[PDB]
Design a protein around this nucleic acid. Structure first.
Length: 49
DNA sequence: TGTCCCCCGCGTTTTAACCGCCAAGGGGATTACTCCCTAGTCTCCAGGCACGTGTCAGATATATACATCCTGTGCATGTATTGAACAGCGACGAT
């Protein structure tokens, strides 16, 4: 259930890509082991009707 | 110590206390007289007190239940502190 759409320069994850933090998460070590570029999420989410 | 008000002092206004003098009868003081009541005396005896006794109302000891008195937990709420998640600005490389 880990799917990633790769075509040319377009990258998009159809199942798994975001995590819920690095504090205590073994994913932090996985990121230190496997080349993972981690980008923070800006929680600003505007709403339009 | 601090406030508010309750008397104190003083001038002006109002009242009746006080004094002086006369007029009158109510009642207290005083006397004379009579008898009813109480002190004094005697004899008579039961009402009242000492003495003895028997016992139950009450003091004492011991066990339990009730009251209460006070301090120590809880609660709840407000506030202070701290962590985290919004927000720079600039230098760099990739496009």
């Amino acid at each position: 259930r880990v799917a990633t759409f790769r075509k040319g320069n377009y990258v998009a994850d159809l199942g798994a890509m975001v995590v819920t933090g690095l504090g205590g998460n073994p994913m932090a070590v996985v990121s230190k082991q496997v080349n993972m570029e981690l980008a923070k999420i800006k929680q600003k989410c505007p709403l339009y009707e």
